[PDB]
Design an enzyme around this catalytic site. Sequence first.
Site, short mmCIF file in Angstrom:
data_model
loop_
_atom_site.label_atom_id
_atom_site.label_comp_id
_atom_site.label_asym_id
_atom_site.label_seq_id
_atom_site.Cartn_x
_atom_site.Cartn_y
_atom_site.Cartn_z
CG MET B 162 -1.46 1.83 -25.13
SD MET B 162 -1.15 0.05 -25.31
CE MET B 162 0.57 0.15 -25.85
CB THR B 165 -7.23 3.42 -18.68
OG1 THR B 165 -6.89 2.08 -19.08
CG2 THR B 165 -7.70 3.41 -17.25
CB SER B 171 -11.46 -4.28 -15.91
OG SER B 171 -10.27 -4.57 -15.15
N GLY B 423 19.57 -13.79 1.14
CA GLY B 423 19.46 -13.53 2.56
C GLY B 423 19.10 -12.08 2.85
CD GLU B 447 -1.64 -2.84 -22.57
OE1 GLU B 447 -2.61 -3.34 -23.19
OE2 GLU B 447 -1.25 -1.66 -22.76
CB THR B 449 -6.52 -7.53 -13.87
OG1 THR B 449 -7.81 -8.06 -14.21
CG2 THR B 449 -6.61 -6.03 -13.62
CE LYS B 461 -8.10 -14.32 -27.14
NZ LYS B 461 -8.27 -13.55 -28.40
C1 FAD Z 1 16.43 -5.52 7.90
C2 FAD Z 1 17.33 -6.42 8.71
C3 FAD Z 1 17.57 -6.12 10.04
C4 FAD Z 1 18.41 -6.94 10.81
N1 FAD Z 1 18.58 -6.63 12.17
C5 FAD Z 1 19.36 -7.42 12.89
C6 FAD Z 1 19.61 -7.07 14.28
O1 FAD Z 1 19.15 -6.12 14.90
N2 FAD Z 1 20.46 -7.94 14.93
C7 FAD Z 1 21.05 -9.05 14.38
O2 FAD Z 1 21.78 -9.74 15.09
N3 FAD Z 1 20.83 -9.36 13.06
C8 FAD Z 1 20.03 -8.58 12.36
N4 FAD Z 1 19.80 -8.90 11.04
C9 FAD Z 1 20.51 -10.06 10.49
C10 FAD Z 1 19.61 -11.13 9.93
O3 FAD Z 1 19.31 -12.02 11.00
C11 FAD Z 1 20.33 -11.86 8.80
O4 FAD Z 1 20.18 -11.09 7.61
C12 FAD Z 1 19.80 -13.27 8.54
O5 FAD Z 1 20.09 -14.10 9.67
C13 FAD Z 1 20.39 -13.89 7.29
O6 FAD Z 1 21.82 -13.67 7.27
P1 FAD Z 1 22.57 -13.25 5.93
O7 FAD Z 1 21.90 -11.97 5.44
O8 FAD Z 1 24.01 -13.21 6.14
O9 FAD Z 1 22.18 -14.43 4.90
P2 FAD Z 1 22.91 -15.82 4.67
O10 FAD Z 1 23.09 -16.47 5.97
O11 FAD Z 1 24.16 -15.51 3.85
O12 FAD Z 1 21.81 -16.54 3.79
C14 FAD Z 1 21.86 -16.53 2.34
C15 FAD Z 1 20.96 -17.64 1.84
O13 FAD Z 1 21.51 -18.93 2.21
C16 FAD Z 1 20.55 -19.68 2.92
N5 FAD Z 1 21.26 -20.48 3.92
C17 FAD Z 1 22.30 -20.10 4.73
N6 FAD Z 1 22.71 -21.04 5.55
C18 FAD Z 1 21.87 -22.11 5.26
C19 FAD Z 1 21.79 -23.41 5.79
N7 FAD Z 1 22.59 -23.87 6.75
N8 FAD Z 1 20.83 -24.23 5.29
C20 FAD Z 1 20.02 -23.77 4.33
N9 FAD Z 1 20.02 -22.57 3.75
C21 FAD Z 1 20.97 -21.78 4.27
C22 FAD Z 1 19.60 -18.66 3.54
O14 FAD Z 1 18.30 -19.22 3.80
C23 FAD Z 1 19.56 -17.60 2.44
O15 FAD Z 1 18.61 -18.00 1.46
C24 FAD Z 1 18.97 -8.08 10.23
C25 FAD Z 1 18.75 -8.36 8.89
C26 FAD Z 1 17.93 -7.55 8.12
C27 FAD Z 1 17.70 -7.88 6.68
C1 FAD Z 2 1.34 1.50 -14.57
C2 FAD Z 2 0.12 1.41 -15.45
C3 FAD Z 2 0.18 1.91 -16.75
C4 FAD Z 2 -0.92 1.84 -17.59
N1 FAD Z 2 -0.81 2.35 -18.89
C5 FAD Z 2 -1.88 2.28 -19.67
C6 FAD Z 2 -1.80 2.84 -21.02
O1 FAD Z 2 -0.82 3.38 -21.53
N2 FAD Z 2 -2.95 2.71 -21.74
C7 FAD Z 2 -4.13 2.13 -21.30
O2 FAD Z 2 -5.10 2.09 -22.07
N3 FAD Z 2 -4.21 1.63 -20.03
C8 FAD Z 2 -3.14 1.71 -19.27
N4 FAD Z 2 -3.22 1.21 -17.98
C9 FAD Z 2 -4.48 0.61 -17.53
C10 FAD Z 2 -4.50 -0.87 -17.71
O3 FAD Z 2 -4.73 -1.15 -19.08
C11 FAD Z 2 -5.58 -1.50 -16.83
O4 FAD Z 2 -6.70 -1.81 -17.66
C12 FAD Z 2 -6.09 -0.78 -15.59
O5 FAD Z 2 -5.00 -0.40 -14.76
C13 FAD Z 2 -7.02 -1.70 -14.82
O6 FAD Z 2 -8.24 -0.99 -14.53
P1 FAD Z 2 -8.47 -0.32 -13.12
O7 FAD Z 2 -7.12 0.17 -12.60
O8 FAD Z 2 -9.59 0.65 -13.22
O9 FAD Z 2 -8.92 -1.60 -12.24
P2 FAD Z 2 -10.41 -2.16 -12.19
O10 FAD Z 2 -10.88 -2.45 -13.56
O11 FAD Z 2 -11.24 -1.23 -11.31
O12 FAD Z 2 -10.14 -3.53 -11.42
C14 FAD Z 2 -10.14 -3.60 -9.97
C15 FAD Z 2 -10.25 -5.04 -9.58
O13 FAD Z 2 -11.52 -5.57 -10.05
C16 FAD Z 2 -11.30 -6.72 -10.83
N5 FAD Z 2 -12.34 -6.77 -11.86
C17 FAD Z 2 -12.83 -5.72 -12.58
N6 FAD Z 2 -13.75 -6.07 -13.46
C18 FAD Z 2 -13.85 -7.44 -13.30
C19 FAD Z 2 -14.66 -8.41 -13.92
N7 FAD Z 2 -15.55 -8.13 -14.88
N8 FAD Z 2 -14.51 -9.69 -13.52
C20 FAD Z 2 -13.63 -9.98 -12.56
N9 FAD Z 2 -12.83 -9.14 -11.89
C21 FAD Z 2 -13.00 -7.88 -12.30
C22 FAD Z 2 -9.88 -6.58 -11.39
O14 FAD Z 2 -9.31 -7.85 -11.71
C23 FAD Z 2 -9.17 -5.93 -10.20
O15 FAD Z 2 -8.73 -6.95 -9.31
C24 FAD Z 2 -2.10 1.25 -17.12
C25 FAD Z 2 -2.17 0.74 -15.83
C26 FAD Z 2 -1.07 0.82 -14.99
C27 FAD Z 2 -1.16 0.26 -13.60
#
Ligand code: FAD
Ligand code: FAD
Lengths: 606, 604
Positions: B162, B165, B171, B423, B447, B449, B461
Site C-alpha cells: 500500500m 505516504t 497523517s 529484573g 496506519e 497515529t 465514528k
Molecule cells: C545493566 C545492568 C548493570 C548492572 N550493574 C551492576 C553493578 O555494577 N554492580 C552490581 O552490584 N549490580 C549490578 N547490576 C545488578 C542489578 O542491581 C540487578 O539486576 C537488580 O538488583 C535486580 O536483580 P535481578 O536481575 O537478579 O532481578 P530479581 O531480583 O531476580 O528480580 C526479578 C523480579 O522480581 C522482583 N522482586 C524480587 N525480589 C522482590 C521482593 N522481595 N519484593 C518484590 N518484588 C521482588 C523484582 O522487582 C523483579 O521484578 C546491574 C544490572 C543491570 C541490568
Molecule cells: C515502519 C513504518 C512503516 C510504514 N509503512 C507504510 C506503508 O506501507 N504504507 C503507507 O501508506 N504508510 C506507511 N507508513 C506511514 C504511516 O501510514 C503513517 O501515516 C506515517 O508514518 C505518519 O506520518 P508522518 O510519519 O509523516 O508523521 P506526521 O503526520 O508528520 O505526524 C507527526 C506528529 O504530528 C501529529 N499530527 C499530525 N497531524 C495531526 C493532526 N491533524 N492532528 C493532531 N496531531 C497531528 C501526529 O500524531 C504525530 O504525533 C509507515 C510508517 C512506519 C513508521
Amino acid sequence: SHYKSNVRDQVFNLFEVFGVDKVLGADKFSDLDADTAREMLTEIARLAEGPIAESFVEGDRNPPVFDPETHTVTLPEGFKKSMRALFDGGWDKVGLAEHLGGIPMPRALQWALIEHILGANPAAYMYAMGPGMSEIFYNNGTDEQKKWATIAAERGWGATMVLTEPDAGSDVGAGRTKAVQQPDGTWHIEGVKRFITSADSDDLFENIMHLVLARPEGAGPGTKGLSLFFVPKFHFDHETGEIGERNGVFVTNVEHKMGLKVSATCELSLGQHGIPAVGWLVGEVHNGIAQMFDVIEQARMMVGTKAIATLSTGYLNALEYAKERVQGADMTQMTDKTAPRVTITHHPDVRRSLMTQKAYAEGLRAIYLYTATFQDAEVAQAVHGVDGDLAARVNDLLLPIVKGFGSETAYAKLTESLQTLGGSGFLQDYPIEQYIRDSKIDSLYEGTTAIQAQDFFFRKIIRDKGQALAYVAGEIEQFIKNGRLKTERELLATALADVQGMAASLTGYLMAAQEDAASIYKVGLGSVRFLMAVGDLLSGWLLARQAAVAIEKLDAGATGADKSFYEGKIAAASFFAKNMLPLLTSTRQIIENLDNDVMELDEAAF
Amino acid sequence: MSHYKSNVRDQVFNLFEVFGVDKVLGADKFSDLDADTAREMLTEIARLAEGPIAESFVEGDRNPPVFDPETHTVTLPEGFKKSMRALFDGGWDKVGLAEHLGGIPMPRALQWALIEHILGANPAAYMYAMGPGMSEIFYNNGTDEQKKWATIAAERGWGATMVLTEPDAGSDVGAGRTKAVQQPDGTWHIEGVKRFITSADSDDLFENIMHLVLARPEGAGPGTKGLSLFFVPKFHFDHETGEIGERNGVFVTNVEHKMGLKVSATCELSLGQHGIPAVGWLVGEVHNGIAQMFDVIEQARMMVGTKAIATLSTGYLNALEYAKERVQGADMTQMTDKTAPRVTITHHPDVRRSLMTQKAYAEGLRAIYLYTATFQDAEVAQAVHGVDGDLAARVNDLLLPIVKGFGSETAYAKLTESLQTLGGSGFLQDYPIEQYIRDSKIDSLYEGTTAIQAQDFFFRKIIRDKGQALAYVAGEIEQFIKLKTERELLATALADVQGMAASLTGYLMAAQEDAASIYKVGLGSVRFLMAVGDLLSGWLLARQAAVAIEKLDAGATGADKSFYEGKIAAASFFAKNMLPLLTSTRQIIENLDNDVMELDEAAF
Ligand SMILES: Cc1cc2nc3c(=O)[nH]c(=O)nc-3n(C[C@H](O)[C@H](O)[C@H](O)COP(=O)(O)OP(=O)(O)OC[C@H]3O[C@@H](n4cnc5c(N)ncnc54)[C@H](O)[C@@H]3O)c2cc1C
Ligand SMILES: Cc1cc2nc3c(=O)[nH]c(=O)nc-3n(C[C@H](O)[C@H](O)[C@H](O)COP(=O)(O)OP(=O)(O)OC[C@H]3O[C@@H](n4cnc5c(N)ncnc54)[C@H](O)[C@@H]3O)c2cc1C
C-alpha cells in the site's frame, strides 16, 4: 549533536528558586562564586553537546567487543575520545574532595553539572565514576587505605561496585561469594559476580578498583554477614602507585543489552583462574552492607539524574522537530480542505504531548535538585533552615523518589517524545529510540522499582517514624496556605490529602499484619503506586513553587526570552495540577480498597 | 521451545464459550467448516508459529535486511525466508481469502485468531504474506478485466504494498503530490517519491509485487477527494497468462534503519525516476482512490491492533514462565527473618500485581479484537448479536480505532511490566521481551497515529454516525450491568465515559460560536479513546467471568477450573484497579481549558 541541554532551567532552579548561591563564596565554598558556577554549567553543557555527545550513536552502533582469552573489552575509538575530553577537563572529579584534587561545591551544583554528561552519553559518566568511588573508599578506609584512595583518585583509576550474583540480585544477602582470610591479614575472594558495570574498560585507565561484597568464611547469613573488600585489577606499589602484577579478578562475559550498549556489563570471576583475587577489608572492619550503601546512595542519585537528563533532551528534540514539521490544517479549519497547512505545534494533541513532556522533565529536574539541597548540611541550613540530622533523613526519603519515580517517569514520557516525531520517531536517524532503549535499564539496576518502593515505605517512612515525610508535607501545606495560583493550590491540597490518605491506608495494612500476617501483602500491592503518587505530588508542588517565582519575575518586568521562559513555567505548573494531580484521587480510592484476592489465587490460574 | 508462547485455549474460550461463533460454523458461507476443524486449524497454526515462524524472530532483528544500490533490491536473511516458505507451503497466506481465489471461507473472528499466532511469532512474516488479501481487495474494486489480473496475482502469491505516504504527506494523506499522467492507450504514468513503504521489495520471496499506489491525476482537485488508486506491478506481465515480463519503473531507493520490526523492509519507493515509466492502471477505471484505499487501511488497522495484542500476550506468558521459576527473596510475611526460606517471585505482591495487570490487559485486548471481528461478517453479527448488516458495519467501524489505537498504546505500555518481571535479565537480548518492546513501538505510529485514531473515533465514528454504534455498545454494557461489585464498578465507568462523550460533544458543538472551543476536543480525544478501551476491557472481562462462573458451577475441573478461576480474578482485578481511574479522567476532561493553546510557542 543529539544532545540538547537546558542550562537556563538549571540556573533558574539553583539561583532563583532554591537560592543555592547563598552559600557560594562562604565556608566550604569560599573559593567558588555564583558567576563561576554559571560558567562551569555553560562549559560542561558545551562539552557535552560537542565532544561527549559526538560518540553517543557510535557507542550503540559499534558496541564493545570482548576477548574471552584476555578477559578484556575493546571500546569504540570515538567513545574513548569522548572519555579523554571528559578527563582532560577534569570532569571525572566534579565535587571531589579538595584533598583528592577536586573543586569543592554544593552537591546541587555537582549533579547539575553531571546532568549534561548523563544526557549526552550516560555511559561516559559511568566509566568516570572512579574518583568519586575512591573518595567513598577514602572515607571508609584505614589511614593506610586512605593513601591508596588518594593515589587512585589522583591517577583517575576506574572503579566498580560488585554485589550481584546469578542467584543474588534483589536479595543481596543471599550472595555466596566468599572471603578467605590469609595469615598476613589480606583476604582471597572466591566467587562469580554478574551484571557488573565497567568491570573492564579497555585502556581508559591504569587500574580499576573493584569494591566487592563477599562473605567471610564462617560469617552469618544475610546482608549482616557481608563485608566489603578493596580488590584492585592490578596489584600496585602502595607507596608510589606503580602498577604491578595482575590480580586474580577477570571478566568472563559481557552482556548483550537492549541499550546502554557502550557500558560493558560483565560477569566477573574472582579467584577462578588459579590466581588469587587478593582483597583488603575496607576500614579493616566487617561492616559491608553499611559501607556499600554509601556507594548505592550515590548510584541511585546518578540513575535518577540520568533518567531525567535523557527525558529532557528527548523533549527538546521532539519540540525542535514539532516546530518545523508542517502537517495538516489548523483544527479550526479541518472542514476546509484548502486551508493552509500548519506546523504541528498548532495541533492540540501535540501541545498536550509537549506540555506533558515539559512538565515532567522540569518537575523531575526540580526534584533531583531539591533532593541535592539536603545533601550538604550547610546548604540545607541556608536554603531551608534545616539541621543536619533532619536534612539527612529528608535526603534519604527523597532518593527512592529520584531513582524510582524518575526512572519510571522518564521512560514512560519518552513515549510521548517519540510519538511527536510520527513515523520518523521509529527511525534510528533520530535519537529518541536510543533514549528509550538506554533508559529502560533505569528501572532495573541499583534496585528495581519494587525495591525502591519497599525501601521508601518501610525504611524511609515507617522506620523513620515519618519525621522526614512530615517535614516535606508541612512545606507543601505552607505553600498551599500562602491569588493567581488559587486553582493550583486547591488542586495541590487535594493531592496532598490523597497522598496522606494513601500513607494512612498502607500504615493501616501494616498494623493489621500484627493480627493477620497476610495483611502485609496489601502494603506490597500498593507500594509502587504510593511511590509514584508522592513523585507526582512533589512534581506538582515544585512546579507550582517555580510558577510563583516566575509570576514574581514577570510582574517585575521580564522581557524577551526571559519572559517566554517564565510564561512556560506558569503553564507547566497549571497543566500539571489540572491534568496529572487529579488522578491521585482515584489511586487513593484504589489503595483504600486493596484486597488479597490476587494473592490467594492459585499460581496455575495465571 | 520458541520465544513465542501461544494461547489457543483463550482464543477458543472467546470464540465458542463467550461469543458463540460456532453457531455459524457448518452453515451458509461456512457450510464446509465445522467447529472441530476450526479448533484443529488454530492448534495447527499455533504450532507453525511456535516452530518455523518463530525460529527466525531473532535472526531477522540481529541480521536485518540490506539494501543493494547496484540492483535497487533488498536482501533478506535466509532464516527468515525459510520461515516465509513454511507459511506459504502450509497455505496459510489464503486463510479467509475468497473461495474463488483459492481460500477457505471462515468467519473473520476465526481468521484474526489464526493470524494472531503469526503476528506473535514473527509479525513481519504476516506483513510480507498480505499479498493475496490485497489482491482480493483489488479484485473487488476492479473492472472485469482487472479481476482477471487480480486472480493471477492471488493464485501466484505475489507480494503487495500500500503506497500512500510521502515525505510531506503522512497523517495528511490529502497533501500528496505524486502525479498520474494518462497515456494515449489508457494506462497512466506515475511520477513521485513515496516514503515508509512496507515490503516495497522482498528479495526473491515472490515473482512479482503488486503496488497499490495513491496518486493525483493531472488536473484533479486538491484533497483526498482528488486522489485515485493505481495498480502498479513491479514487473509487467501478460494479462492473460501471467507470464512475467519487463521491469516496470518502480524502484526502492533506500531501506530505513528502524528501532525494531527490522526484518520488514520499510523503503523509499520512487516511481518513474530511473527513467523507465511506472505504468499504472486506474483501479476500477474510476477516480475514487481514498475510498478504495480505505478497504486496505481498514484491514491494516485490524492487523496492527491484533499484532500489538499478540505481542503483549507472548510477552506476558514469557514473564509468567520466568516468574514461576525465579527464586528471589523471602515471603513478605517473613521479611524480618533473614533465615526464612527463599521463594519464587510469583509469591511477591508487586509481581502478582504486575502479572495480573499484564494478564488482564492481554486477555481484555484479545476479547476486544475478537468482539470487533464478530461484526465484520453480517452472518456472524446476526447469529451472535441479533444485529443487522448496517448496524454491524457501523459498530465494526466504531471499534476499529479502539483495536488499533487502544491496542497499540496498551500493549507497548504493559510490556514494560513484562520486562520488569525479569529484573535485570529483562534488559538482555537473551530474552525476547526487549525485542517485543522495540517491535511494538511502531504500532502507535503507522496506519494512522494514535491521535489520528482518536480523531477518527470521535469525529467520524461517533459524531458523523450520530452516536448510533456508540449507543448500541453502551446499551449492551448497561444490559450486562443490569459479580455485583464488578457490575457496580462497571456502572461507574460507563457513566464516566458517557460524561466524557457529553463534555467533548459540547466542546465541538460550541465551536460554531467560539472556534477555539474545538481545541478542547483535540486535547481530550486520546484520553477518551483510551477510556473507552478500558471500559470495553472491563466489560468483556466481566462477561468472561460470568461464563467462567457458569462453567465452575457446572463442575469444571483440572486445568479448565484453573483457567476459569483466572478469568474471575482478572475481571475483579481490572474492575477494582483499572476502571476507577476513569472517574478522574472524566473530571479532567470536564475541566479542559485552552491555556495550553494560547501559550506562546517560544515558552515551551
Ligand atoms: C545493566 C545492568 C548493570 C548492572 N550493574 C551492576 C553493578 O555494577 N554492580 C552490581 O552490584 N549490580 C549490578 N547490576 C545488578 C542489578 O542491581 C540487578 O539486576 C537488580 O538488583 C535486580 O536483580 P535481578 O536481575 O537478579 O532481578 P530479581 O531480583 O531476580 O528480580 C526479578 C523480579 O522480581 C522482583 N522482586 C524480587 N525480589 C522482590 C521482593 N522481595 N519484593 C518484590 N518484588 C521482588 C523484582 O522487582 C523483579 O521484578 C546491574 C544490572 C543491570 C541490568
Ligand atoms: C515502519 C513504518 C512503516 C510504514 N509503512 C507504510 C506503508 O506501507 N504504507 C503507507 O501508506 N504508510 C506507511 N507508513 C506511514 C504511516 O501510514 C503513517 O501515516 C506515517 O508514518 C505518519 O506520518 P508522518 O510519519 O509523516 O508523521 P506526521 O503526520 O508528520 O505526524 C507527526 C506528529 O504530528 C501529529 N499530527 C499530525 N497531524 C495531526 C493532526 N491533524 N492532528 C493532531 N496531531 C497531528 C501526529 O500524531 C504525530 O504525533 C509507515 C510508517 C512506519 C513508521
